[PDB]
Amino acid sequence: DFYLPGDYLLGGLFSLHANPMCKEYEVKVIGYNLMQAMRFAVEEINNDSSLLPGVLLGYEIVDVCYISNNVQPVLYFLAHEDNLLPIQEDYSNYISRVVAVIGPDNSESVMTVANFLSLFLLPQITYSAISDELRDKVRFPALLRTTPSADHHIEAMVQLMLHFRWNWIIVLVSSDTYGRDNGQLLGERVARRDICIAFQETLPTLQPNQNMTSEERQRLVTIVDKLQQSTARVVVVFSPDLTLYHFFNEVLRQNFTGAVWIASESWAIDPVLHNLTELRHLGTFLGITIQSVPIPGFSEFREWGTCNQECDNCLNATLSFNTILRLSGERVVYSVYSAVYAVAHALHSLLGCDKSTCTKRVVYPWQLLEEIWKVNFTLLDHQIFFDPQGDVALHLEIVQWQWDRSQNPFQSVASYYPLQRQLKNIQDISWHTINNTIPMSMCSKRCQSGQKKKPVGIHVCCFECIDCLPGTFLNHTEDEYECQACPNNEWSYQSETSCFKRQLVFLEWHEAPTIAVALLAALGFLSTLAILVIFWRHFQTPIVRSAGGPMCFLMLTLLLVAYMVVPVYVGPPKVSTCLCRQALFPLCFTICISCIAVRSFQIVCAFKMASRFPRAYSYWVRYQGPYVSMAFITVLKMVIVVIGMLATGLSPTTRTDPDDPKITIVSCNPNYRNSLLFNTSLDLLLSVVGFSFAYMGKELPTNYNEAKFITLSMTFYFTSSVSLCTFMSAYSGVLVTIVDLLVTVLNLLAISLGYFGPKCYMILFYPERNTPAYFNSMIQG
């Protein structure tokens, strides 16, 4: 069970026990299983006549004892039958007693043996070691391998992680070199693949024989409590099963229910951990192993019953766990069996056998290495060829840990092709979710439409979701990370990753208030036209003339402009209509008010004040003091207009209506409120001063009645201005322009139908007042 003579032997280094004498160590069923696998491989090769006619192969296994018995195995190998190994510079002339050694399973022991073998350049196929260092060939020329590297395992792991959408993971790696190396590899693999580790922390070693030392006890308590505190519920673990036993025991005692534990090869499949059969309450356990077509006739071989070369009770443990092994269908046995067959095929080609008779040429080790580096052969419908870096294209496979003792303790979920570097054929997988769903494991829920995502913590996976304010829309189209503004008429609101529209609003002619005021102004303008027609029709009277004579028409003429301007208020508040309303309408309004004000001023002066300063008022009237005064008023208003234009913006402003963005008031000026106040305060002052003077001269002339009209106009304009003030102070958002047009007509009518209209009214009702004699008597009195 450990030796077989032959012509060209095949050394073996199976690890029989774990945790010189080495049967005191804990027995490992897998070690003897793999030993029997290699035995079956060599036996089948020798039985066959096609593979190698005659030229009997030979084997010999020396237990490696995990890490303890590494040097002695190889030294006994590559040594003469008398156990003397000479030292030479050139070893091309050395006949090592074993052509090629197999067996080193632990990566560290694999390196330890491979150093010496590279010294002698002995072929060495490692059947289970995984560390990526062995990929390097400058360090290990003769370290062929028939199981994929750890990088392929980690890629399968991360592709499984992606397929179920878990970007928030946790990593637990033992202290030994294996754990740290696999952890670094997973970190570098996931830092690029959208997945962010919640936290990677070391798992202290706990041997089964260990008495669970205290410091380790509270360290592990820290580990588990941090685990359950966090939100990542996919826990990838890289550690030998020996420590996993204690770790899982303690965590199970700790009530950590929701968790998806990913296992590494080291313990992805192993009878020791499977036999616990009490982990159904910790969720689902996944791992990665290597799948291959089952050896056709190896289980029947199994069931059949140098230092530390032999073992004590390996067969008893194998018989105990035979049910699991047969149901589980051990597959690393294929790894070692294919390694033995690759060595056999290399020895076959090297001997150049003609398929019927072989020349038993003395074979050097390095020659077999050169020939084995290129074997290309079928094996149970699996192609065996080594890539230039010493590795075979052997299908990995995701293993779901099924507790049910019915059959198949290990379940095949996903198949991972290394040549394509892709994990696929993911069959149905049951979980720990109550509905048999895919367990969630994410750092933060994806933000709903309309909110930006701003990162939280160092990791780029998760963020806080914030509904970016109105006018800013989630730019998921280009940059989903940060929300972006939505300028111009486009306007967004809370959330709403898509903007809305702003409608500019101005003064139209359809709104019922607009129609009503337009009709009011049309009636007023028709009244003004009738007043003008009567005035021109009765210029012979002293009522028409004393209102200004021909110059009175000018007021009326200028008055016409305002009515013409009245619609000019309606229409888009573009630069043109704006400049019109800002330059000429104030001109009319002002001259219209001020000429009447000066009329009253001089009427009362000739009545009352002129006597106070007779010479002064006479010299003033020399150049038409009244006409001089309101000429200066026209000049002052021109000054106000130009100053307002200089200090104020002609162009309109589409100021957002506070009621809703979709309505935006196109105010003809940025601050037409205060600008209008500055323009019309002078009008108010002039009107009130004229009213006060008329009130002083309230002794209205019998035929002139200047008070009865002028005072009405002035008081009602004062009230109108205050009404406009109140409406602004309320600031009815919409309709400001239409009410302003209402008010413009309001004061226009104030002047027109408060002063001029009554003149025509009395002219038509009775002409006696127009009698020149009565007019002169009234002037005197």
Binding site: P86, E89, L119, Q200, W366, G457, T711
Partner: protein, 803 residues
């Protein structure tokens, strides 16, 4: 040709072994392994030969010395390592073959084994250290290394025969962690070389971070300079993390090349300066001292080994090279060493030995030599003790086997150059360290001492410049054991430490463990840093509000004056003046003042939506009726003032009787009509806002549009304005107080009040909006009496008195 290879062995009695890099294997054979042959190492190295000469000096010293190993001389088996296990393992296998043979047996037992050398002066490179130590451990041959520093080599289950000097990376890493702990630097991001050195140091430092307390922030590796050049890109990412983690301290356990690449990129990218806790592999190497601009990259400070330099070494090296030039001595030693292993030593060529004294006379004062020197003494002393020798000879009964040393090499005390070194159980001596800085003065970083390390740090922060400004120590701390109120976002590469964030206003925390400031309903009120949602208090137009109380008092005053006036009106019925002021229409007006009091009085207290609906319209109602009475009087006065004669008489006749009351009730009807109209259009309702102010829930009579109320009031206001136009023009009565002027003050003040308080009402805050509204009607109604009826009373209580 210099005589070196001949000197690279000596016979002695208990031959030592050497595994040094006297050469550097060319970078072809290492890659070209198709034939089983070790690559040659023709390329010469200086430090390797210096170390070999140091071993030679130590051996010659012990042999010459009398009290140490009397009568027993020690030899050499100087063999090259070429910094490559493939070519360094053949000499190792040679060291353990057999006494004077070339075959290494594979017997199960090693107790009966008799190797050729007694011990090995272990290699320098730690990969070589691991490989050769794994090989030597089984055969229990004491291997003392002079340059190995990886911590695994101290694992005395797989390396039981390793007795390195040059303490491991563990000790300097503990020194760095202790420095961080005593400088309060929990939040530290530790980098490492991609090679095994960096990863090993990083793992040890993770364990030390867990133990001491400092919380790792970013645990990455910096790739070595390689032909891929994607390394450079990767560095940026690693470097980027240092920027992102917000760390002022970074542990760089990188080798000289890796740290060189890191710092070159850091300068080239304008990286923010920070403390750079260094390592012995780069803290002094010139390849990182030469980089331009490095002075502006924070304070570089790290622990460097302390140990007496092997003085009197330069003279010995110069003398030995010169004597190796001398033909006589070379020929003599060649004759002495004939047919033996004097040729199998490394660099055995002529040219392999033919060099110039300047070829090696550069690192003559190299700190590694002492280690090599120390190593020999160690084994010397070890041997001196395992033979139980004393001063002036010793029995030396049987050739001592190496495992005898193994037994009698642990916890050994030997003095090297006056330094009493001593191994520990793990086999590594404990030498102290000193904190070397990188103070810059002229772009030539000078390193100076800050504090020493005897296993416990003795720093003194005062000396370190700390760059930054005002030599402020860069604080890189992590919020640990923070205030419970904040929300706790766990950070760090390990779960260690966390960021604490004060919660926002309006959002509470369900439990301390949860990681979100939960947002509760507006019914509760949540200020900053409150894990709870606190209910507010109702805020309304209560009868007890100070403004509301003042308004109630004003209403009481108004009621009193109204009752006084109406008592005078009920009494003075016969007097023509009372009637001429309005008659029983003015009685309707005075009771309408009382009724507008009875109307406006619905505002204060707990408001109901129904109260909002039914309050303001019936509020305008009685005031509207009384003001309609006022309008009757004013219009009659205006018609009297006009002079149409016939029209005045007709209007007086029409208005004296039926039309007066008809118009009064028509005004009442119009008021109720527009009341119903607005109630259909914009009926105000009681609504509650909780976000208007934080600590209270503002329940108040929200108005759908104050424009509707404005128009409802404006009905009576426009009647007021019509009578105002009718009455203002009237000139004062000749020799008598004018009647029209009473109405004139009345309505003019009424406008001055309402036109005024509409904007004042709009400006004021929402809940007082009804409050001042109260006052409005009060002031409003007050106005009338203060400007309409006060003269009426004045006369009535003075009309009898005047006459």
């Amino acid at each position: 040709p210099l005589c070196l290879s001949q000197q690279l062995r000596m016979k002695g009695d208990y031959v030592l072994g050497g595994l040094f890099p006297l050469g550097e294997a060319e970078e072809a054979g290492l890659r070209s392994r198709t034939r089983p042959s070790s690559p040659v190492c023709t390329r010469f190295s200086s430090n390797g030969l210096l170390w070999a000469l140091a071993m030679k000096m130590a051996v010659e010293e012990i042999n010459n010395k009398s009290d140490l190993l009397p009568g027993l001389r020690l030899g050499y088996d100087l063999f090259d390592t070429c910094s490559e296990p493939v070519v360094a393992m053949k000499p190792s296998l040679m060291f353990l073959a057999k006494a004077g043979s070339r075959d290494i047996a594979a017997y199960c037992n090693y107790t009966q084994y008799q190797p050729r050398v007694l011990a090995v002066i272990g290699p320098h490179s730690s990969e070589l250290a691991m490989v050769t130590g794994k090989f030597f451990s089984f055969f229990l041959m004491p291997q003392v290394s002079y340059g190995a520093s990886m911590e695994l080599l101290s694992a005395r289950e797989t390396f039981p025969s390793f007795f390195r000097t040059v303490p491991s990376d563990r000790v300097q890493l503990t020194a760095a962690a202790e420095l961080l702990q005593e400088f309060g630097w929990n939040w530290v991001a530790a980098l490492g070389s991609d090679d095994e050195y960096g990863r090993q140091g990083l793992s040890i430092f993770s364990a030390l971070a867990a133990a001491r307390g400092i919380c790792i922030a970013h645990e990455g590796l910096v790739p070595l300079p390689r032909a891929d050049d994607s390394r450079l890109g990767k560095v940026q990412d690693v470097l980027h993390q240092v920027n992102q983690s917000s760390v002022q301290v970074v542990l760089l356990f990188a080798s000289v090349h890796a740290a060189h690449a890191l710092f070159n990129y850091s300068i080239s990218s304008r990286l923010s300066p920070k403390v750079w806790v260094a390592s012995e592999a780069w803290l002094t190497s010139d390849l990182v001292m030469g980089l331009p601009g490095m002075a502006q990259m924070g304070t570089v400070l790290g622990f460097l080994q302390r140990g007496a330099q092997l003085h009197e070494f330069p003279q010995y090296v110069k003398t030995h090279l010169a004597l190796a030039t001398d033909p006589a001595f070379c020929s003599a030693l060649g004759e002495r060493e004939q047919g033996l292993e004097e040729d199998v030593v490394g660099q055995r060529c002529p040219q392999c030995d033919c060099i110039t004294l300047q070829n090696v006379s550069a690192g003559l004062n190299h700190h590694q030599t002492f280690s090599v020197y120390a190593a020999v003494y160690s084994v010397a002393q070890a041997l001196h003790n395992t033979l139980q020798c004393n001063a002036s000879g010793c029995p030396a009964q049987d050739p001592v086997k190496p495992w005898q040393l193994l037994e009698n090499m642990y916890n050994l005390t030997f003095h090297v150059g006056g330094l009493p070194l001593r191994f520990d159980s793990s086999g590594n001596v404990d030498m102290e360290y000193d904190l070397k800085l990188w103070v810059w003065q002229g772009s030539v970083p000078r390193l100076h001492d800050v504090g020493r390390f005897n296993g416990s740090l003795r720093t003194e922060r005062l000396k370190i410049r700390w760059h930054t400004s005002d030599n402020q120590k860069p604080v890189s701390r992590c919020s640990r054991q923070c205030q419970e109120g904040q929300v706790r976002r766990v950070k760090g590469f390990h779960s260690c430490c966390y960021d604490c964030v004060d919660c926002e206003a309006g959002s509470y925390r369900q439990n301390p463990d949860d990681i979100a400031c939960t947002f509760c309903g507006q019914d509760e009120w949540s200020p900053e840093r409150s894990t709870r949602c606190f209910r507010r208090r109702s805020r309304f137009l209560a009868w007890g509000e100070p403004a509301v109380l003042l308004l109630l008092l004003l209403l009481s005053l108004a009621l009193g004056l109204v009752l006084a006036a109406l008592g005078l009106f009920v009494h003075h019925r016969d007097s023509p003046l009372v009637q001429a002021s309005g008659g029983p229409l003015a009685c309707f007006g005075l009771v309408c003042l009382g009724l507008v009091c009875l109307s406006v009085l619905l505002f204060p207290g707990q408001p109901s939506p129904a109260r909002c609906l039914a309050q303001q319209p019936l509020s305008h109602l009685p005031l509207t009726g009384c003001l309609s009475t006022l309008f009757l009087q004013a219009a009659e006065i205006f018609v009297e003032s006009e002079l149409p004669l016939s029209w005045a008489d007709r209007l007086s006749g029409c208005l004296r009787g039926p039309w007066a009351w008809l118009v009064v009730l028509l005004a009442m009807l119009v008021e109720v009509a527009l009341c119903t109209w607005y109630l259909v259009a914009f009926p105000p309702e009681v609504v509650t806002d909780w976000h208007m102010l934080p600590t209270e829930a503002l329940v108040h009579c929200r108005t759908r549009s104050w424009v509707s109320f404005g128009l409802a009031h404006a009905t009576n206001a426009t009647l007021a304005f019509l009578c105002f136009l009718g009455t203002f023009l009237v000139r004062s009565q000749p020799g008598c107080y004018n009647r029209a002027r009473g109405l004139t003050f009345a309505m003019l003040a009424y406008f001055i009040t309402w036109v005024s308080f509409v904007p004042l009402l709009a400006n004021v805050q929402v809940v007082l909006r009804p409050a001042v509204q109260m006052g409005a009607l009060l002031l409003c109604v007050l106005g009338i009496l203060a400007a309409f009826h006060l003269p009426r009373c004045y006369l009535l209580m003075r009309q009898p008195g005047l006459n």
